[model samples]
Target chain A: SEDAGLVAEAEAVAAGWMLDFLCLSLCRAFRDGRSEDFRRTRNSAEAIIHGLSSLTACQLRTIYICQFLTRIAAGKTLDAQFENDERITPLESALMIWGSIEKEHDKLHEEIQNLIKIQAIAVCMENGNFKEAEEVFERIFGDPNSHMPFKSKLLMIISQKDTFHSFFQHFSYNHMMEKIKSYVNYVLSEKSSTFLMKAAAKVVE
Target chain B: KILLTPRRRQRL
Candidate 1:
């Protein structure tokens, strides 16, 4: 049994090292913006990446790309707070794409920033900072150009069946619930679940 | 006050 354990450990090291090399090359492909190459590698290594505890430079870089893409696909943005809140290194590299993202990532950058704020609001809500969440919520809500799908996601987050005003008692719940309910219903009925469902499934899986 | 759903909380 001891000999077998030693053999297994050696084999594990060898296998892990090969994966590390392959992943590093994939990360380079991402840095170079080779979408097809990155996609192929991701399909092959997705499960392995999830299971890995010690990631290489390549794997980490690739992850930020995936995250950046997720926000883009969701029609959302990222907040600058992430720069400080999460110390994971490769995130900056992903955003560095912004340095050249047209330098002019203009609209992409805007969407990215919005997603960041949305994530911040989600974190605030998670921490029971309802006031903070409300502040961010109202700010975005009042934006005439705020995307309806994103607004729907925000609404789903804030309201409870018929009593969204429970968060702010001064706003009469009964009076607002009628109109809010209709809006929520319409938002829910739309075909805007792509990012939500994908993210949700990934989270659960 | 509103709280995060299990899903969102897990994300946090």
Candidate 2:
């Protein structure tokens, strides 16, 4: 009945409207540096806002934030409501604090940027753009600061193209936090911020 | 990605 209800409600949803709204919000929270907000709104936001082009104000936030979320969300720090007293939002507090991350999001620091590039490369790899993925992968791996993780059951699944496909199939179809994290951690391990190239063949095959 | 939130509106 719930499935049928969703299908019936989904029929009334203006075509593509649900997707567009979720993307807009995800972008707003992420680029504006509020990705955890984007995640909180995951019902409408997942499986979208993942492209790289000149960003709108909203999309800038999504692309910027999603990369960060991918790393830290698994660390159990993804909730936006949880805040330290010293940490403040200019919009919320109407006041600025000394140790503020308002203008300066340390998450966007050098290591994180490279990590993002690595994630971008992983996107390409997922798409089967071996050469493009290799190029992006090369940059991430070549960087001395990059640090792809090692040793995980998920990594074993991600090592092969077929398994990679299978992993995503389950990831998107389920859209549960557990499945999402399993895949996210798996990719994070392969995504390099600083490490020797694992060989493009490894990614391709 | 468009957040496509169920309107992306809610309270914490």
Candidate 3:
């Protein structure tokens, strides 16, 4: 049973990395204004999401955010003045998802909660809602003497530079890469089972 | 944009 659980965990981890890679590719497609590429990458991501038997809150949040940004990218492709367009339903849905999670705040890790807020801020900024973005930003970095993590500080710098897309791209890439690296290290370490080492090799391959 | 070195590309 424990081996089954470990295999499932490894599968989930691999799926998560695959999703992250697709998200990065989507971001690059958006950046290059390649609608075809964006759609293809998005479909692959959706396939992974559908294939997963279960998803963590973090995974759900990432998917929602991807959908939210996809809508924005679609608006831009149509030359619609997205700032004044009626295509904000996805944005509202994304916000509602974040709000729902916040309401059950204790269920999520503190770091994940903060990351969610950061992503919300990025989405709001991308929608040209600077005022709302600032409000959410203050909710995280409001305290004058609060300690800031390295990743948080990095995100804050990117947000200040007004590169919201880059922020999302880099944030997810770094987070997933770190997680993948840690898992690989753990599996390759002396304490890991031979089975886990083989699993890790397959994943890395 | 930063160009990837051969070593970096290999690593990635």
Candidate 4:
């Protein structure tokens, strides 16, 4: 038993080092803006997640979220590079990660859970899964009176109507506009001056 | 926006 305790301590130390390395690699990949670097970083993250038995569920969630966000950023860079040869789009990859961790979603803090849902909504929108996006959006913002700090960020994403315009081509313009207008109105009703200012600026863009 | 950009290493 004593030897097993020592072994566990040693494993924890090694896991800690691996986590630190993963963070550094992720930062480098982000700064460099290279898809290969992101892929490599993502691979490293997956390796740690699968190989480390010492990690807790919370630690695994952190790694998964980091990997998910890396894919989102990669999607933007890949778009600029016109690289569409991959088996799955970055947005798709993000969704897969979200699906894999569905069980842990409720275990997270409220704000963290909402943030994850928001990211899911974004990826769904980008993937032209508007129906899924609407479902997730309703989960977080169903109640008009619900107060959430992420409202402005979500509004900013929604304000980029032009970005999603092509995806909305098949849908009814009037219906879409009405739905978006309602979301904007909800943000506008917030009493916080800071929220109002941010909402206004994002809506203008 | 910071949300879109690479998170700062310090923030991590």
Candidate 5:
């Protein structure tokens, strides 16, 4: 009985290490655009995630979890038949994990929400639903200027799709009046961070 | 000596 507890403890520690190793490998593969190993790595990671004890799961923070989810989301966008698998995708797993967070994660919660929304935008783009993607984008980001930390990231993702880029250009021009109205509203709003933007621009200049 | 601003005085 004593040995059983010890054995479980050892298994948990080893599982954490295994998860760390998998995350690093997945992150490296993503960085290098080597997607061949993503599915394999995800299988191992999923097994580890479900196998861990609740105590062990509590011990781990969101670092590797976010990394694995991002990797999965990225992989799904690359494969055309991503939804054909019919099983839960990595983005779905991330959403499920996010949904399970009962307590406040403070900054981590905000970051996770941002990550999920970005992945949603990517998913829509991947599925050739640019209208929905742009709607999701503008909803979360409400006319945030260039200085917003995630703006470049959001831009980089949408720009990756060639057809989306051309379509976006035409769409923006067609919606120029609507964009101007939103810009006016944003500038006139008391919540506007005009001073902060000016300060950041000065720093850049 | 220069006078401390109210914010700085509060800190002190």
Candidate 6:
């Protein structure tokens, strides 16, 4: 039991994904001409996602959490930002530590140490250390070279080498991302900006 | 205008 090792950990996580699929099915039922299914699936997904916290590597859990987020994206039920707001779920609070909220700032160096920090942040969130949640996010953000890119339009202006923000102003993201890229780029450059993607995008823009 | 403050050192 105790000696199941890393593969055991990854499989346990995939099981969490299977449960997430069932949970998403519940959400679709709610949205399409039905009275009540979203809450059940969301609750179940919460349970499944929380169960994943037992795994040692945040990346292992990330594989599953990303699957869950993908489900939310596909099912079009991601309207629940409150679930990830620092004020709401402990899981989201921990992810804030993982620096996923930073969107494109994730760089893959110092991998082991980042995993350790991810573990520590999870515990801190479990124990109600909200400030540490922010500290974890800031800790990852502290890397000077790490920065967010909006689906990013990085370039060196040929003539002026103007060396400003890299959006060439011509090359851009697709329609959805055209809109999304602006918000992602803004959060990358601005501190104290929140990570919201729906109606909030309208006001924040 | 933005204020650029001097840095203080801390330890690990």
**lDDT (10s digit) by residue, model 6, range A12-119:** 767644553543343344334243454455556555655554544533433333333323222211122223232323323233433433334334323322333333
- Per-model TM against the reference: 0.29, 0.24, 0.37, 0.41, 0.42, 0.25
Q: How would you encode candidate 4's per-residue C-alpha lDDT over A1-205 as one tens digit per residue? A: 6699898888776675565455545554544556588677777766666667766664665566565556555543323211133333344455455556545334433433444445545655666655545555555565856767666556556656434643334333333324323322333343123433345558887
What are the runs in model 5 whose C-alpha is more than 4 Å off? A55-59, A62-130, A142-205, B1-12
Model 5 earns a TM-score of 0.42
| Model 3 misplacement above 4 A | A1-3, A76-205, B1-12
> Each candidate's interface RMSD, rounded to one decimal?
12.0, 10.0, 17.2, 12.1, 28.5, 19.0
Q: Which candidate is the best by TM-score?
A: 5
- Which candidate would rank higher by lDDT, 1 or 2? 1
Give the better candidate number (2 or 5) by DockQ.
2
Of the pair 4 and 6, which is ahead by lDDT?
Answer: 4
Tens digits of per-residue lDDT, candidate 5, A1-205, equal 6699898887877676665555544444444446577556666666666676754453354333433345344434422222323333334434444555523645655555555555556666767866655665665556657355466667676657543544334333224324323322422342223343344547988
DockQ-based ranking, best first?
Answer: 1, 2, 4, 6, 3, 5
Label model 1 with its docking quality class. Answer: incorrect
Per-residue lDDT value at A89 in model 4: 38
Q: List candidate 2 stretches off by more than 4 Å.
A: A1-115, A143-205, B1-12
Per-model lDDT: 0.42, 0.36, 0.50, 0.50, 0.47, 0.36
TM-score of chain A of 1: 0.29
Comparing to the true complex, what docking class would candidate 4 get?
incorrect
Tens digit of per-residue lDDT, candidate 1, span A1-205: 6698787776555445444444443444444557677666655555555555565554454454444432222212223223333321122323333233322446644554444444534544554656656665665456645664356666666553232333333222232333323322333333224333445557988
lDDT of 1 at A48: 52
Residues forming the 10-long window of minimal summed lDDT in candidate 4 chain A: A76-85
What are the DockQ scores of the candidates, in order?
0.06, 0.05, 0.02, 0.03, 0.01, 0.02
Top model number, DockQ: 1
Candidate 2 structure quality by residue, lDDT tens digits, A1-205: 5698787665434323433444344444433446667567554445444322234454444333343343333222212221233221111111111123224534323333333333333444465645544443443345534555421322343345331454444433223334334433433443322121234326766
